[PDB]
Amino acid sequence: HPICEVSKVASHLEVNCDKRNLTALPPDLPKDTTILHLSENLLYTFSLATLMPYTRLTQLNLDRAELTKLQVDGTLPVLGTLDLSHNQLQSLPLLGQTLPALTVLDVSFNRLTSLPLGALRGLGELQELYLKGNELKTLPPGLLTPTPKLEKLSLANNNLTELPAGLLNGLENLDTLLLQENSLYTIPKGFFGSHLLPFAFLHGNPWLCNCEILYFRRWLQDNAENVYVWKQGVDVKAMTSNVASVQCDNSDKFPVYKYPGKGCPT
Ligand SMILES: *[C@@H]1O[C@H](CO)[C@@H](O[C@@H]2O[C@H](CO)[C@@H](O[C@@H]3O[C@H](CO)[C@@H](O)[C@H](O[C@H]4O[C@H](CO)[C@@H](O)[C@H](O)[C@@H]4O)[C@@H]3O)[C@H](O)[C@H]2NC(C)=O)[C@H](O)[C@H]1NC(C)=O
Ligand SMILES: [Pt+2]
Ligand SMILES: [Pt+2]
């Protein structure tokens, strides 16, 4: 109670242990704790197990903590949100066997260059995945199979050149897809499926406007009302689209939805 700043507000309390040169979990944290901020600390190494005691813990922040190795010992059946952004994890952690109730996981701006074959197994309650800012160049086959309830996915600002044709297969709740600032050249036929994607960010990519981009073109047209441009400091980006932001080779004067496709089949 008297080490970090403990908030209160109706039952579920919030403990802030940020910017406090901590190298590990502080000993006198209230037991019936629910949210823990531990950002801007020196957690070069951290063991999810040391939280076994806080049976009411639902949100944990370990962002901007020079984190390099996350240990996944036992279980925290009630943890739903986990923030790992702005650390140095060279490999993505396997949380399935520990955070069965995790609905949000952010592992942005870390040092990821790929993702394992079972990466998200067990994470069936996931509703949000943030992996923006790494150096992913390719995604695994059924990555999102374990997460059929996914709503938001961020793979922005990586080095992706191609996306799996079925990456979205099954996700009928998906509403936000951020793939901006990558190295994508095309979208596999029927990639978006028939689902309705409200917020799709596809700008900043070197799209190759050849016949094999006519699928994406029609989609762009059908969903021009759903294509937006990212604004850092995000303003909920809830208003005014810009389908002309998706462009051939990133040339502003040659948006994809206006791509002619001269001499292409129907
Ligand atoms: C992922 O995509 C981003 C966005 O496109 C990309 O950023 C830019 O890439 C170029 C490289 O094509 C950057 O220039 C780099 O500068 C250093 C050179 O020392 C290196 O990062 C790159 O090449 C080096 O690679 C090794 C060192 O890492 C060595 O073999 C040797 O030093 C090579 O030169 C490249 O030259 C350019 O500055 C960035 N822009 C910025 C400021 O971000 C990023 O490079 C891509 N990363 C991957 C996964 O390749
Ligand atoms: Pt960030
Ligand atoms: Pt759908």
Curated annotation (Swiss-Prot):
Domain LRRNT: 1-31
Organism: Homo sapiens
Effect recorded for residue 239 to V: In VWDP; increased binding to vWF
Segments annotated as LRR repeats: 32-52, 56-77, 78-99, 101-121, 125-146, 149-170, 173-194
Source species, domain of life: Eukaryota
Glycosylation sites: 21, 159
Ranges of residues in domain LRRCT: 205-266
Protein name: Glycocalicin
Disulfide bonds: 4-17, 209-248, 211-264
